[PDB]
């Protein structure tokens, strides 16, 4: 807007708040807002320990006590009744173990996988945000939907340490702590093809467009528009997409 640049080719989203200031061409790339998260770092397997009991040291106390009373039953009418008594005592122990295992499994099955963005909007332990002074932050201000309004309210409530300056800091913020990002899905596709440790949770929130930034009121923008439409007709954009996004 100060005419210090006559063209902008870095990928900026086409929005209503910037159409009234500067001009854009046709979008050479389509876009969607999505959420980057780490993969769930759980599911401990039985390669060294497989967690057979619950309260394990006191389970070993139970095993030692039953082996001791089995030795006592071996060394000394009454034998049938005492063996039946310890038989249904072991049945009581088995019933308590079954009840505790069933409670643990029912608790483990009833969990939220935070797939949608509204599940991120509900909770506050999982901190979230976006790139500062970007199109995603500006879209969250003007969003009249109450879910994204709640997300922008939580972003503005703790604005000191949730708005990074670059997407490399986005990777450094996802890879530690419990942070999830809301940004452009092509960058998410690039960082998931480059690193197979992250997931894109949820679909595309809303569509946008990567255009060429031009100063307002130029026929240079129209010539750029016809050039981009002919180049996408020429198919070299698909070749550049297959060259750069792969690997």
């Amino acid at each position: 807007i100060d005419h210090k640049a006559d063209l902008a080719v870095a990928p900026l989203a086409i929005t209503y708040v910037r159409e009234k200031v500067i001009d854009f061409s046709k979008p050479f790339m389509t876009l969607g807002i999505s959420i980057l998260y780490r993969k769930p770092n759980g599911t401990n397997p039985g390669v060294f320990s497989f967690l057979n009991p619950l309260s394990p040291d006191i389970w070993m106390y139970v095993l030692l006590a039953y082996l001791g009373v089995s030795v006592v039953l071996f060394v000394i009418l009454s034998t049938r009744i005492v063996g039946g008594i310890w038989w249904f005592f072991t049945l009581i122990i088995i019933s308590s173990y079954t009840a505790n295992l069933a409670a643990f499994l029912t608790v483990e099955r009833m969990e939220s996988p935070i797939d949608s963005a509204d599940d991120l909007a509900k909770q506050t332990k999982i901190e979230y945000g976006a790139v500062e002074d970007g199109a995603t932050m500006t879209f969250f201000k003007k969003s009249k939907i109450s879910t994204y309004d709640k997300m922008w309210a939580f972003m503005s409530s703790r604005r000191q340490s949730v708005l990074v300056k670059s997407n490399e800091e986005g990777i450094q913020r996802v890879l530690t702590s419990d942070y999830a990002f809301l940004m452009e899905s092509t960058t998410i596709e690039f960082v998931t093809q480059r690193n197979c440790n992250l997931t894109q949770i949820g679909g595309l929130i809303d569509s946008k467009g990567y255009g060429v930034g031009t100063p307002m009121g130029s026929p240079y923008r129209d010539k750029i528009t016809i050039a981009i439409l002919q180049l996408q007709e020429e198919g070299k954009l698909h070749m550049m997409k297959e060259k750069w996004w792969r690997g």
């Binding site: 006191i58 000394i76 009454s78 005492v82 122990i93």
Partner: peptide, 23 residues
């Protein structure tokens, strides 16, 4: 402990009753 403490208590009570019956 807790439930297992009562299990150990009733195990010791069954042992004392077995000792009393076995005489």
């Amino acid at each position: 402990v807790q439930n297992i403490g009562g299990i150990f208590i009733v195990l010791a009570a069954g042992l004392v009753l077995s000792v009393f019956v076995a005489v």
